[PDB]
Write a protein that binds this DNA or RNA. Sequence first.
RNA 1: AAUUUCUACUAAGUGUAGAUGGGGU
Length: 1121
Amino acid sequence: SKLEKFTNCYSLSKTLRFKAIPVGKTQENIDNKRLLVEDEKRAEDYKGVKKLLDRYYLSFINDVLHSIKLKNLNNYISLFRKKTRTEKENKELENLEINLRKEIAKAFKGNEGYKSLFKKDIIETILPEFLDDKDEIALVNSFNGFTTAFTGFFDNRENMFSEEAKSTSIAFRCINENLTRYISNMDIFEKVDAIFDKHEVQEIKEKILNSDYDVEDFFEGEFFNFVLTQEGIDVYNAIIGGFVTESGEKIKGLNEYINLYNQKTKQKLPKFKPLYKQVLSDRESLSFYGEGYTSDEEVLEVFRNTLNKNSEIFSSIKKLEKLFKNFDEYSSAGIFVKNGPAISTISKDIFGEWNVIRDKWNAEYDDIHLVTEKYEDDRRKSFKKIGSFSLEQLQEYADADLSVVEKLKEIIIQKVDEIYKVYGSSEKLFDADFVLEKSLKKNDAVVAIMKDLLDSVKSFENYIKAFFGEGKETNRDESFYGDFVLAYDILLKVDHIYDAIRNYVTQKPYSKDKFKLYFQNPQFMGGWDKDKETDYRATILRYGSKYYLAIMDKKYAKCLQKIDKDDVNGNYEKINYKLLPYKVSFESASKKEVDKLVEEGKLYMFQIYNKDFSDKSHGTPNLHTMYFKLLFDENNHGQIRLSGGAELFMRRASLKKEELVVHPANSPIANKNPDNPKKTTTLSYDVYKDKRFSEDQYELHIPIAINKCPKNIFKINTEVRVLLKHDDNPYVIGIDRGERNLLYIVVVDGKGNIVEQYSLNEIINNFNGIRIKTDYHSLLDKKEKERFEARQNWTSIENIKELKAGYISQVVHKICELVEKYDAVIALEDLNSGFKNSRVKVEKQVYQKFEKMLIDKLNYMVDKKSNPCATGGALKGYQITNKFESFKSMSTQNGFIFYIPAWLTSKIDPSTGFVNLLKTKYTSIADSKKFISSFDRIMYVPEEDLFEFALDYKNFSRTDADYIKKWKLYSYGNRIRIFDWEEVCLTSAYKELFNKYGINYQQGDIRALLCEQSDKAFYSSFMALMSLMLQMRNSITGRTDVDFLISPVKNSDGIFYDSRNYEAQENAILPKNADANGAYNIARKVLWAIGQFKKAEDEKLDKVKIAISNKEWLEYAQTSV
RNA sequence: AAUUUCUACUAAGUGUAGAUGGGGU
C-alpha cells in the first residue's frame, strides 16, 4: 500500500482545546479567595502597559539614534544615486543600500542593554525608572513576574528591527522609502529654490533649531545629512511638511512652501516629500490599527462622519486623475502602471478585451525574438519581468485613436462616481442622531448600507493602486507622483475601517474572549512533571470515565501529594506523567480527600468536558476527544504525547439563558434537511440557541504533540515518485471542481480507465447504519439564494464561506477515504498557474484552503472510525503530505498531492484526444478562407448526413502542441449554443447555411466553393458553427442533467463520443459528463507524470519535471486513447 | 436547534455526521 509507507515521518504538535467546569465547591472557593479577578485585572491592563513599554522603545529609537547619527559606512549616504558605479543601478544601488540596513542596526543592537529592554527586566526595573507617575509605575509592577504575557509583544517589537530592511523596520522607513523622499537636500538645491527667499527661507531658518542654523539639509539636491531614524523626523518635515509656530507665525515648511510655485506658478518642484517614520508606535504593522467597535453606536463610521480623512482624499485622487490630461504635457511616460493581475482588467477597461495588452506585447516580442511551446514560456516570463507599463508605452500597445491615458482617466473617474453615489445613500447613517432600530447585526438594512459604501471606496482603492508602477523606475512624473501618493496613503485608511465594520457585523452573536488564568502564579500549568507537582500546580485527574484538572493554590500547593490513596473510594487518578512534556502512569489518588480539598479551598478541581463525555452521547466521538482520551490510554506508546503548558483561560458569559432562542418542550421540531425522511422531531425538553456561550466556560487548551519521535523520516516527494513508478496500476483520485458537481472525483486507474465518477455534492452522513444525505450543493444553492437578496449581505457571504469551509471539512474526509481505499494520489490543480473561473463551486481561496487542509490533514490523516492503533487510526495518521509552507509552495508535489496545471483537461475529447487548438473566431474573410483552405478536404458526406472537415493541424497556428495533426471534423450531433441557449443540430444548420448561400454542398470536395464565397457573413456563421462542432462540453445554462461531451471526430470504431450515452450507464468507461472529463484528465496529466517516473532513472527521480506542457499533453491524450 | 470550537444538522432523544494548533501582536 502506497499510503502505509508514509507514517511516523515528521512531527507536528497541536492544542486540543476543551472546557472545564468547576466541580465541587471550586467556583465558590475561587470567588471567596478572589482567585481570578487579578488575572482579569491584568488582562484589562495589558494594553495599558503595552503602551508604556512602547514609550521606552520609542526613546530607544530616539536617544540611541540622536547620538549615533552619522550614517556610518556610506559617508552620509552621499553616494546614494550619485553616479552609476560598477554595474548600472545594479550593485550601484543594492550594495550601498544593504550596508545601509546595518548602519542602523549597529546603532541599536549592541547598546546599553538591548536584552535588558527586550526581556523580563524592563517592566521589573528599567520601565519603572523610566516612568515616574505612581499610577503608571504601579501598573507596570503589577504586571511583573507576569512578563511571560508580554513575550509575544517583546519578540514582535524586537525582531521587526534588525539588519534587514523592508518588512517593518527602521531601515524601511529609515533608509529605503525614507531616502526616496529625502536625498534632494544637501547639495544642488537649485530647482527647488524657485522661491526660498529672505521672507521665506530666512524666516524659517531662525525658527528651526539652530543646530541647523541655515537650511542646508532641507532642499537642494544630490545627497542628504540629517534625521536618519531619529533626530526628530519632524525636523525634516518642519519646512517639508510645515510646522506652524504655536505663537501664530505661519511657518510653511519648505515644500509646504513650493505650493506657491509647485502649483501656483505650476510645475513639479523637485518632490520634497514628508519623511516617513516608524509604523504605528514603533515599526508595528498598520498605522491605522485601532480597536473599539464593540457597540452598535461605537463610532458612527470614520468615513465622512468619523473618518473625514478618507472622504477628503477620494476627492484628491479624483482631482489628480483629472489632471492626467495636463500630465500628458508634463510626462505621460512618467506615470506607470503595475503589470500583474490588474493589467488584464486595465486592458478590458481601456482597449476592450482582456488580452489586448498581453497579445500586443507578445507580437512585439515576436518582432524581436522570433509560435512554439517554449516560445510561449519565453514571452510569459518576460511579461512577468515587466513590472510597469508607462502610460505612453501602453499607448503604443494600443488600437487606433484610443487614448489609453484618457480612457483610463474616464474609467477611474467613474469609479469615484460610484463611491459618491453610495455616499448619498449613507446619509442616514452619517446623520448625527441616527435612529438605531433593531441593533446592527439584526438590522440588515444598515448592514447593507454600510457594506455598499465601504466596498465602493475599497474598489476605487484597488483600481487606482496600479497607477503606481513598481516605484523603482526613472522618469516618474513628479506632478502626479508625490501628490497622488500622499492622497493614496490615506485612501489606504479605508481598508481598516471596512474590515472593522465588516467584522463587527459578521460577528457571532456571542464572544470567545478569554483571560489567562494564572491564579496568582506566573508559572501556572506550564508542565506535567511528576517531580515538580508544586511548581506549575496542576494534574489531570481521572474518575474512570471522566477527566479532571486539579490545581492547588498558594498556601496549600502540595496537599494532594500528602493525602493520596483513598483505597475503597472512587479515586480521582492523579497523573503520574514520568516522561517529559511514553510514561503515562496514573497514580490512583483520592476521592473523599480530593473533594474535601475542593470544598475547603485548597484544590480547585475542574472538569474536562466535550460533548462526547456525556452519558447521553449516542455515537462517534470527535477526533480531538479521541486524541485526548488516547493521551491517557495505554495504546499511546509515544505518538500523541503531552507538550506541556495547558493554557487555562476563562471565557465568560456573552449571552444569557433568558435571551436565547428556545424550542419549547413537547412541541414538534421541524427538520430542515430536504432529504430527511423523518421530518419533525418533538423533543421532551427545550433546546436553546448557544447555551455554552450563555454560561461561563473555563477553556483548557491542552498542548499535545504528535510524533515527536519520528522513526521513518524521509523526503516525501521523492518517495512518492518512487512509489509511483514501481506500481503496475497507479490510481489517481483526480479532483476537479466543476459547475454541476462541487468537487467531482474521477478515480482513474493506471491505464486511464474511469473506475469511479461521483460528484461529491452530497455527503451521505452515516450514523447508526442509516445514511441520511445532505445536498451540500442544494444547501449551497439555498445559501446562494439568500445571497441573491439583500445584495449579498456580509453574513450571507460568511455563511457561504463557512458552509464551504464545513463542506471542505467534509470532502477532506471523503477524499481521505477515497485515497485510503484506492491508494490513490490526489491530482489537485496547481493553483498558482491558470484559472478555472466557470466553476460555481469551490473557489480558488476555498480550494487553497482545501489543499492546505489536505496537507494539514495529510500530515496526520485520521479517520475517526478506524481503530486508533491501526493505520489511518488516531495515532497512526498518514503523513503522505508535506507540511504547509506557503500557498506558493503548493505548485509541484507535496507528497500524494500532485499539483498539475489544469490546462485543457476539461475541453478535450476523452475518446479521441481532440483538443480545439485552433482559434475559430471569425476575424476576416481571408482569415477563415485560410482556415477553410488549410483543411485537407471539406466534403459533404451525404451518406450519413455529415460534413467532414479533414484538417491538417501541422498546417495551422499555435498548434505545435498536437500529435496526430490530422483530424476529420464531421459536423455531427447536437450543440448547445449559449448566447440564452439554443440546441442547434450541426448537420442541419450546415446544410441550411449552404442551401441558403447557394453553396452546393453536394459536390465532393466543396472546399473551393467555401473559400469561393464572397459573402462576409457566410464565414461568420461558418466559423461559428465550426466553433460549435469543436466545442465538446455542452450544457444548458441552469438545467442540471444536460452535462454531456460531444466529439467532432470519430474514434477507431467510428463512433462519436457522447457523454449522454455514458451518463445513462452506471459503470461508464468514458466521462459521463463535462466535469467528470475534467477530473478524468487531471488524473491523466498526473498520469503522464507517473509514466515519466518509469521513464526517468531511479536516483534521478527528483528533477523530473512533472510540469506537463501542452505538447506532451495533446500527445498521450491523442495517442493512448 | 443544543457543540472544546466550527460546519451541516436533529441524526433514534440533552444529542448526530465530519473536521479542529493556538498562543501572543
